[PDB]
Copies of this chain bind each other. A is one copy, B any other.
Amino acid sequence: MREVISIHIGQAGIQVGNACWELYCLEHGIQPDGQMPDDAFNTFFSETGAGKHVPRCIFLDLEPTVVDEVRTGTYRQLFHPEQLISGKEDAANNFARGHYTIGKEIVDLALDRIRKLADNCTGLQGFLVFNAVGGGTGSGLGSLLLERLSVDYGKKSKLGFTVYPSPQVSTAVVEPYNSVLSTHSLLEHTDVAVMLDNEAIYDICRRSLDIERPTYTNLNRLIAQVISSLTASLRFDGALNVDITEFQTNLVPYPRIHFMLSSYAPIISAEKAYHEQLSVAEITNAAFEPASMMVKCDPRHGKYMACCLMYRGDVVPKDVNASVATIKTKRTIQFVDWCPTGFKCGINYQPPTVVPGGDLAKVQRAVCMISNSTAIGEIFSRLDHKFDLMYAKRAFVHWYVGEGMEEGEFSEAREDLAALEKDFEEVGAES
């Protein structure tokens, strides 16, 4: 009855889906060969006639080079091969290729597969969309998929975890274009968006886990931990259960402002765990610490508008309340005036799980804080300034105009982003 659908688009989408599913199988005792040696797996899986638990996910991409690694790996008995969707040619880091030229041939089969996947569902909670803004496939194809999903379902709730184009560390040069294009396209259709940045998670892995050379898999382990914490209350008991609609309602104040930060605590090494105590007050202080933000935004350049917290393990509601009251009394935390309230808290009795050969440490308390602050104006300003600096000269524009676009799409997107940053300015201004 408590069922969700997961969509991993682009390369980073499936790169993090692999981690999420290695997490879920291990957490629920599911062997890699589908079956295990109720109501606990039914959130992510489906039971066939005998024992087999096939996951209710979809891996969508345009490069065969990664879906075939998945098909040949140990996690090949899991998926219905019709879920792993690949294309002959890729989008080549081009929003126009991803949106107008290539993705419109496989949207039909992606949608009918989503239909067949949601048919067996009894009570559908919402769509998780793991996307990576900055690469043509990810950006354009997710925009197209979200428009189709909004016209099909509409009433359903879409969370989008979008690996966002980073300030300085960047493996691309054209991404300031497709980031603006993807935002202007999906803004009207996603129900909530969680931003997170490779630089911020690199800094976290550096300062906390003492790892100095993370090969894109530690970041995925961290994202898997985050989603497990976020969706615990769907498949695990505990006081103050919280689901997707409760999550989005008390967090998205206006139709425009739906982008939000993220954090996690504690996040430590197997020795600092053994040599620390990690009480709930320390955990919440570390969560609200700026240096724990999974995105490259400094919340002290703004004011919070709401926060959501999901405590796990040995946590008591009085301690949660006392720590939230201490945070309120603190002086370095600001709040926009029109929210005297501001915290949606939930508890789960299930501590966070650890993976064999992982890098985190076994703990008994953990917090995944998710706040909607008016400081992401700074990242929107960064992205707009970069798009500006480039489009002042019509750089790279011939690719986008040859692959089935025209010029007006750049102006629409830039004016939408200007309006969005003016929103983030005004709705925070106080009388």
Contacts and interface: CB of A to CB of B under 8 A. Distances in A.
Interface in A105-121: 119-120
B49 A81 contact: no
A271 to B, nearest CB: 6
A364 interface: yes
Contact of A80 (B79, B119, B272, B282): B272
Interface string A256-295: 0000000000000001101111000010000000000000
A228 to B, nearest CB: 22
Q: How many copies does the complex hold?
A: 2
A81 B272 contact: yes
A364 B49 CA distance: 10
A406 interface: no
A74 to B, nearest CB: 16
A303 interface: no
Contact of A277 (B34, B48, B272, B276): B48
A82 interface: yes
A189 interface: no
Contacts of A54: 275
A276 B81 contact: no
A148 interface: no
A271 B81 contact: yes
Interface residues of A, number: 19
Nearest to A269: B81
A414 interface: no
B272 A82 contact: yes
B49 A275 contact: no
A52 interface: yes
A223 B114 CA distance: 33
Contacts of A277: 48-49, 120
Residue of A81, A271, A276 most packed against chain B (CB within 10 A): A276
B274 A48 contact: yes
Contact of A275 (B52, B276, B282): B52
Contact of A48 (B82, B271, B275): B275
Contacts of A82: 272
A106 to B, nearest CB: 16
A82 B207 CA distance: 12
9 contacts: A48-B274, A48-B275, A48-B276, A49-B364, A52-B274, A52-B275, A80-B276, A81-B271, A82-B272
Given A34-B275, A49-B364, A82-B272, 6 more contacts: A48-B276, A52-B274, A52-B275, A79-B275, A81-B271, A81-B272
Interface of A: 34, 48-49, 52, 54, 79-82, 119-120, 271-272, 274-277, 282, 364
Closest 6 CB pairs of A and B: A80-B275, A54-B275, A48-B277, A81-B271, A49-B277, A52-B274
